[PDB]
Each structure stands twice: as C-alpha cells, then as structure tokens.
Amino acid sequence: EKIAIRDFQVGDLVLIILDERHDNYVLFTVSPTLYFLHSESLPALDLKPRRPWVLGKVMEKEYCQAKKAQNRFKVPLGTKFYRVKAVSWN
C-alpha cells in the first residue's frame, strides 16, 4: 500500500481525496498541478457527486485547459489541469 504523489502514470496506486475548495475529487499530490478525478470514475470508486478519501489505481489521464471563467472545476480561466480516470484498488 504505497502511493504515488506526483507525475502520475497509468498503473499508479493513488489516494483520491475530496477537495471542497474545488468541489471535486482530486488526486492527493505534492505538486501544485490539479489532477481532477474524471466524473466517469465516481461510481467505480463508490463516490457520489461525502466519503473523505479512497485508494484508486490510475488508468487514464487527460491534460485540459479551462476555457471559461466559471467552470465545474472552480479554477480560473486559462488554468491547466489533469483529468484522471481511476478504478478501485481491490
């Protein structure tokens, strides 16, 4: 039970945590870059759109750029962030 904390690659066991400032689930990381959990992943991890944290396995990642000021991620315009799909550890 050891987790990656930055430079997430496919196959990494990761810690998925609720981020209330951004009102989404994110990968726990020491990097300043935001790794949002892809919304497709929520049922697979039994998270609804209150559980504080879960372990997951990274399976896909996507590099994105906010193109409007108000967005579902609550990040400023132009911000660049990742979207990650993850499944349950075991």
Binding site: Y63, C64, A66, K68, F73
Partner: peptide, 9 residues
C-alpha cells in the same frame, strides 16, 4: 463541455 478543451503538455 465548452468549459475546457484537451491540450497537449
């Protein structure tokens, strides 16, 4: 959405 686009690192 048009909120965000995929971009190459």
């Amino acid at each position: 959405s048009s909120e965000f686009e995929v971009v190459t690192p």
